Amino acid sequence: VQLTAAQELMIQQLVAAQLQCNKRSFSDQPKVTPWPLQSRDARQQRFAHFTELAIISVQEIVDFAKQVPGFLQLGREDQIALLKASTIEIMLLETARRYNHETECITFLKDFTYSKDDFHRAGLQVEFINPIFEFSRAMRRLGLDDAEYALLIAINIFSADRPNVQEPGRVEALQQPYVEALLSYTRIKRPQDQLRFPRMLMKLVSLRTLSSVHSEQVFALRLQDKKLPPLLSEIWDVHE
């Protein structure tokens, strides 16, 4: 088979919207605390560096889900439920896509790169850091491109089982068109390797575990004097 004129147009839609939202959030060397280069002003700045950058990421994510056909048709409640659970997973998807194997560094922007030790320095736990870098290598092992990532992130946003969804059955209906697009896409990309599509979905399995680990990272974060700025704290902090 082949891509339907519709699907193709949709896949182009997503890849383009993903490009524009990125430009609209990171085309400006962010106004965030600069990475130092020791003391408690870098250990508290480095952490601010990541935290402040993550915020922008949340804004890009929200901005891009608004472009995913079907997303705006749900209710604001469900938009929050969905977005509030996929932010950390979507972030790790992006972190993965932006991973360099030869240098083992994740480069967020141009002249904005970080090593594993940068993450440690930044305040994060080895418990969290290793799993994300391990996930990043697993991701490159699949050799995903821009269409597949866009598609995998869409599929991710529409997870019916996310906590507090009002219209799961509806969220689920919204997902399927994208799964298909990926199924048909992968069939074209490596017809001689049918199990490559399931290896992909499999990454969704790991993004949940990562999401749990990250929560234990939040939990432990708020055991130190490290507090998450308001926006992050909303989506991640446990508060009445």
Binding site: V62, D63, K66, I80, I235
Partner: peptide
């Protein structure tokens, strides 16, 4: 409920 508990997030969804 999920809009009040998440004010800033709610705001991002409406600035569009």
């Amino acid at each position: 409920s999920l809009t009040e508990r998440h004010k800033i997030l709610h705001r991002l969804l409406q600035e569009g």
